Amino acid sequence: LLDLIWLETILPKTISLAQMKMSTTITSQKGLIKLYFLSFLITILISTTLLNFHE
């Protein structure tokens, strides 16, 4: 119960599965230029107004 499942579940497997899920989410882009430049525009919009990086 403890040292073969639960102690093996809370520490290593949670971060392992989280890193796997984040790696699949990040690298699932379609490779389209239009979406990338739209993300660039959204980044500029966020930096200009919401984060006040121009101050």
Q: Of the listed pieces 1-9, 14-22, 31-39, 45-53, which binds ligand 3PE according to CB under 6 A?
A: 14-22
CA 19, CA 14: separation in Å to the nearest integer?
9
Residue from 14, 38, 49, 50 that binds another protein (CB under 8 A)?
A: 38
Residue from 5, 14, 17, 20 that binds another protein (CB under 8 A)?
A: 20
DSSP code per residue over 1-55: -IIIIIHHIIIIIHHHHHHHHHHHHHT-----HHHHHHHHHHHHHIIIIIS-TT-
Q: CB of 9: closest distance to ligand 3PE in angstroms?
A: 11
Summarize as ranges the residues that interact with ligand 3PE (CB under 6 A).
11-12, 15-16, 19-20
